[PDB]
Motif scaffolding. Structure first.
Motif, PDB file in Angstrom:
ATOM      1  N   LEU A   7      26.567   1.358  19.924  1.00 12.55           N
ATOM      2  CA  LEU A   7      26.045   0.144  19.511  1.00 12.55           C
ATOM      3  C   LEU A   7      24.577   0.145  19.573  1.00 12.55           C
ATOM      4  O   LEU A   7      23.698  -0.185  18.584  1.00 12.55           O
ATOM      5  CB  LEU A   7      27.006  -0.976  19.494  1.00 12.55           C
ATOM      6  N   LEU A   8      24.214   0.247  20.884  1.00 13.99           N
ATOM      7  CA  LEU A   8      22.755   0.059  21.395  1.00 13.99           C
ATOM      8  C   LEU A   8      22.143   1.305  20.492  1.00 13.99           C
ATOM      9  O   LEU A   8      20.891   1.097  20.267  1.00 13.99           O
ATOM     10  CB  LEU A   8      22.465   0.328  22.828  1.00 13.99           C
ATOM     11  N   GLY A   9      22.604   2.602  20.583  1.00 12.63           N
ATOM     12  CA  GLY A   9      21.933   3.635  19.667  1.00 12.63           C
ATOM     13  C   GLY A   9      21.853   3.371  18.443  1.00 12.63           C
ATOM     14  O   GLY A   9      20.682   3.501  17.851  1.00 12.63           O
ATOM     15  N   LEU A  10      22.561   2.856  17.573  1.00 10.85           N
ATOM     16  CA  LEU A  10      22.529   2.464  16.404  1.00 10.85           C
ATOM     17  C   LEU A  10      21.624   1.189  16.075  1.00 10.85           C
ATOM     18  O   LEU A  10      20.732   1.191  15.373  1.00 10.85           O
ATOM     19  CB  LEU A  10      23.981   1.518  16.043  1.00 10.85           C
ATOM     20  N   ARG A  11      21.606   0.194  17.105  1.00  9.14           N
ATOM     21  CA  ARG A  11      20.639  -0.741  17.157  1.00  9.14           C
ATOM     22  C   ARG A  11      19.154  -0.073  17.163  1.00  9.14           C
ATOM     23  O   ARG A  11      18.349  -0.874  16.358  1.00  9.14           O
ATOM     24  CB  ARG A  11      21.057  -2.035  18.037  1.00  9.14           C
ATOM     25  N   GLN A  12      19.004   0.735  17.925  1.00  9.71           N
ATOM     26  CA  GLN A  12      17.666   1.300  18.151  1.00  9.71           C
ATOM     27  C   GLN A  12      17.355   2.285  16.904  1.00  9.71           C
ATOM     28  O   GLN A  12      15.961   2.033  16.473  1.00  9.71           O
ATOM     29  CB  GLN A  12      17.691   2.272  19.372  1.00  9.71           C
ATOM     30  N   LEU A  13      18.232   2.632  16.181  1.00  9.29           N
ATOM     31  CA  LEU A  13      17.703   3.331  14.807  1.00  9.29           C
ATOM     32  C   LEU A  13      17.182   2.288  13.962  1.00  9.29           C
ATOM     33  O   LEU A  13      16.310   2.560  13.242  1.00  9.29           O
ATOM     34  CB  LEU A  13      19.076   4.359  14.547  1.00  9.29           C
ATOM     35  N   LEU A  14      18.038   1.236  13.890  1.00 11.06           N
ATOM     36  CA  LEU A  14      17.723   0.217  13.027  1.00 11.06           C
ATOM     37  C   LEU A  14      16.236  -0.488  13.448  1.00 11.06           C
ATOM     38  O   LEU A  14      15.458  -0.771  12.470  1.00 11.06           O
ATOM     39  CB  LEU A  14      18.652  -1.246  13.160  1.00 11.06           C
ATOM     40  N   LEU A  34      29.668   7.694  13.256  1.00 14.69           N
ATOM     41  CA  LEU A  34      30.095   6.619  14.499  1.00 14.69           C
ATOM     42  C   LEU A  34      31.747   6.287  14.172  1.00 14.69           C
ATOM     43  O   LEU A  34      32.395   6.360  15.183  1.00 14.69           O
ATOM     44  CB  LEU A  34      29.472   5.438  14.495  1.00 14.69           C
ATOM     45  N   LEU A  35      31.981   5.910  13.015  1.00 14.82           N
ATOM     46  CA  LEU A  35      33.388   5.602  12.889  1.00 14.82           C
ATOM     47  C   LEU A  35      34.353   6.850  12.818  1.00 14.82           C
ATOM     48  O   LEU A  35      35.424   6.548  13.312  1.00 14.82           O
ATOM     49  CB  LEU A  35      33.465   4.739  11.301  1.00 14.82           C
ATOM     50  N   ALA A  36      33.973   7.889  12.721  1.00 19.68           N
ATOM     51  CA  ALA A  36      34.632   9.233  12.522  1.00 19.68           C
ATOM     52  C   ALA A  36      34.767   9.557  13.760  1.00 19.68           C
ATOM     53  O   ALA A  36      36.155  10.005  13.983  1.00 19.68           O
ATOM     54  CB  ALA A  36      33.808  10.566  11.783  1.00 19.68           C
ATOM     55  N   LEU A 127      38.629   0.870  15.448  1.00 20.26           N
ATOM     56  CA  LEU A 127      37.832   1.085  14.153  1.00 20.26           C
ATOM     57  C   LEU A 127      37.174  -0.387  13.634  1.00 20.26           C
ATOM     58  O   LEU A 127      36.228  -0.783  13.085  1.00 20.26           O
ATOM     59  CB  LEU A 127      38.809   1.471  12.879  1.00 20.26           C
ATOM     60  N   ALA A 128      38.184  -1.585  13.809  1.00 16.77           N
ATOM     61  CA  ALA A 128      37.737  -2.909  13.267  1.00 16.77           C
ATOM     62  C   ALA A 128      36.815  -3.419  14.181  1.00 16.77           C
ATOM     63  O   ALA A 128      35.834  -4.181  13.476  1.00 16.77           O
ATOM     64  CB  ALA A 128      39.113  -3.793  12.987  1.00 16.77           C
ATOM     65  N   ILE A 129      36.879  -3.199  15.358  1.00 15.53           N
ATOM     66  CA  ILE A 129      35.851  -3.812  16.263  1.00 15.53           C
ATOM     67  C   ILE A 129      34.251  -3.024  15.909  1.00 15.53           C
ATOM     68  O   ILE A 129      33.337  -3.806  15.820  1.00 15.53           O
ATOM     69  CB  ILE A 129      36.255  -3.352  17.827  1.00 15.53           C
ATOM     70  N   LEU A 130      34.298  -1.788  15.945  1.00 13.05           N
ATOM     71  CA  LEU A 130      33.014  -0.972  15.597  1.00 13.05           C
ATOM     72  C   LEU A 130      32.762  -1.623  14.250  1.00 13.05           C
ATOM     73  O   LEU A 130      31.455  -1.789  13.966  1.00 13.05           O
ATOM     74  CB  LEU A 130      33.436   0.477  15.644  1.00 13.05           C
ATOM     75  N   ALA A 131      33.679  -1.741  13.214  1.00  8.22           N
ATOM     76  CA  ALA A 131      33.141  -2.068  11.798  1.00  8.22           C
ATOM     77  C   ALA A 131      32.227  -3.640  11.781  1.00  8.22           C
ATOM     78  O   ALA A 131      31.262  -3.497  11.215  1.00  8.22           O
ATOM     79  CB  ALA A 131      34.330  -2.059  10.791  1.00  8.22           C
ATOM     80  N   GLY A 132      32.963  -4.394  12.542  1.00  2.00           N
ATOM     81  CA  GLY A 132      32.381  -5.920  12.497  1.00  2.00           C
ATOM     82  C   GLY A 132      31.047  -5.944  13.171  1.00  2.00           C
ATOM     83  O   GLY A 132      29.954  -6.380  12.800  1.00  2.00           O
ATOM     84  N   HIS A 133      30.971  -5.065  14.362  1.00  5.33           N
ATOM     85  CA  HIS A 133      29.528  -5.070  15.077  1.00  5.33           C
ATOM     86  C   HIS A 133      28.343  -4.231  14.351  1.00  5.33           C
ATOM     87  O   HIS A 133      27.422  -4.594  14.179  1.00  5.33           O
ATOM     88  CB  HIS A 133      29.712  -4.339  16.490  1.00  5.33           C
ATOM     89  N   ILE A 134      28.995  -2.980  13.761  1.00  7.94           N
ATOM     90  CA  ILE A 134      27.914  -2.299  12.852  1.00  7.94           C
ATOM     91  C   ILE A 134      27.393  -3.257  11.834  1.00  7.94           C
ATOM     92  O   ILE A 134      26.112  -3.563  11.299  1.00  7.94           O
ATOM     93  CB  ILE A 134      28.552  -1.201  12.079  1.00  7.94           C
TER      94      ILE A 134
END
Ligand SMILES: Nc1nc2c(ncn2[C@@H]2O[C@@H]3COP(=O)(O)O[C@H]4[C@@H](O)[C@H](n5cnc6c(=O)[nH]c(N)nc65)O[C@@H]4COP(=O)(O)O[C@H]3[C@H]2O)c(=O)[nH]1
Length: 285
Positions: A7-14, A34-36, A127-134
């Motif tokens: 999630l921090l990785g994604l956040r930084q790309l954002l 990420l989801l895969a 999957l559901a946890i990751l989806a909501g945070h993304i």
């Protein structure tokens, strides 16, 4: 720690996106990858979801040989009306909507194929946890147009997500309130606390009903062990900054802690923040 790091990785790309492009179009490959990774997906597509909860059929990204998206497929319609992950268990195998803390469905993951041995509740939960945070992140950091505090808005959205994490998934989080009772040390303690912020932790600088500085710290996705590891780190930091001779407490710091639990009922967090920490509903929602 893997989730937090992903999630921090994604956040930084954002944070580093030009701000020219929509996060969901430009980061679609990364979101799907990420989801895969967490679902051991094999065949999948990521789709934009419209205003009215219908999916845009042309995919933002695909994995393997994903077929064209059956808009009114039963799994797809169910997912989007319910706003939750749905699977075929017992063409599509699973559909996972990306839903933010305000219930906006931003996107849809549609899964054609994943290995049967991961086609279960443990996997559906990740999957559901990751989806909501993304989802939260895709509407997030580049979102400061409302005349409230950016910091205050991000704090409460992160808190709302951690509450859902607890309620829906039994994921733990911790809230600390540092109440600073001695005006001689107040600003220097708060600066030390601000500088310690790590990872997904968010902070809010406030004044309570007795006029004292209060620093709120939320530790998302952090267990009771871990919370204690945080306070242990923090005490080492205070020992460097002030007397090792001295303790946090001798500097006027009063610690209040609230553990977010699946057990913790309805208005427990509310009693913690207000009529305890002595904050109010204009500081955090
Ligand atoms: N939510 C939250 N929890 C905290 C914080 N500080 C400590 N913890 C908890 O305390 C454990 C030990 O932290 P450490 O002594 O800093 O020992 C850490 C540290 O040496 C290193 N590390 C982890 N994350 C970071 C980081 O973001 N920056 C740096 N420089 N080191 C890190 O890995 C070791 C193990 O880290 P973890 O597995 O995360 O395990 C952490 C974590 O569960 C905090 O500010 N927020």
């Amino acid at each position: 720690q893997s989730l937090r790091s992903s999630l921090l990785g994604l956040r930084q790309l954002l944070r580093e996106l030009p701000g020219d492009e929509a996060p969901l179009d430009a980061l679609a490959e990364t979101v799907l990858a990420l989801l895969a990774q967490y679902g051991s997906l094999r065949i999948a597509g990521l789709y934009r979801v419209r205003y009215d909860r219908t999916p845009e059929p042309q995919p933002l990204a695909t994995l393997g040989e994903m077929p064209a998206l059956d808009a009114d497929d039963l799994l797809v319609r169910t997912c989007l009306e319910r706003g939750e992950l749905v699977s075929v268990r017992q063409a599509l195998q699973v559909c996972v909507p990306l839903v933010d803390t305000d219930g906006r469905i931003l996107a849809l993951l549609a899964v054609e194929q994943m290995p049967f041995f991961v086609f279960n509740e443990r996997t559906f939960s990740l999957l559901a946890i990751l989806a909501g945070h993304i989802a939260d992140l895709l509407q997030s950091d580049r979102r400061a147009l409302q005349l409230a505090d950016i910091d205050a808005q991000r704090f409460s959205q992160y808190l709302k997500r951690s509450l859902l994490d607890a309620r829906d998934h039994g994921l733990p989080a911790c809230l600390y309130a540092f109440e600073l009772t001695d005006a001689r040390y107040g600003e220097e303690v708060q600066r030390l606390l601000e500088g310690s912020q790590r990872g997904l932790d968010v902070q809010l600088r406030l004044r309570n009903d007795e006029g004292r500085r209060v620093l709120l710290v939320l530790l998302p996705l952090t267990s009771a062990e871990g919370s204690q590891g945080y306070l242990q780190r923090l005490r080492i930091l205070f020992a460097e900054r002030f007397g090792q001779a001295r303790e946090l407490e001798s500097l006027g710091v009063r610690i209040r802690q609230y553990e977010l639990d699946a057990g913790n009922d309805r208005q427990a967090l509310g009693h913690f923040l207000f009529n305890e920490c002595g904050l109010n509903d204009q500081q955090v929602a």
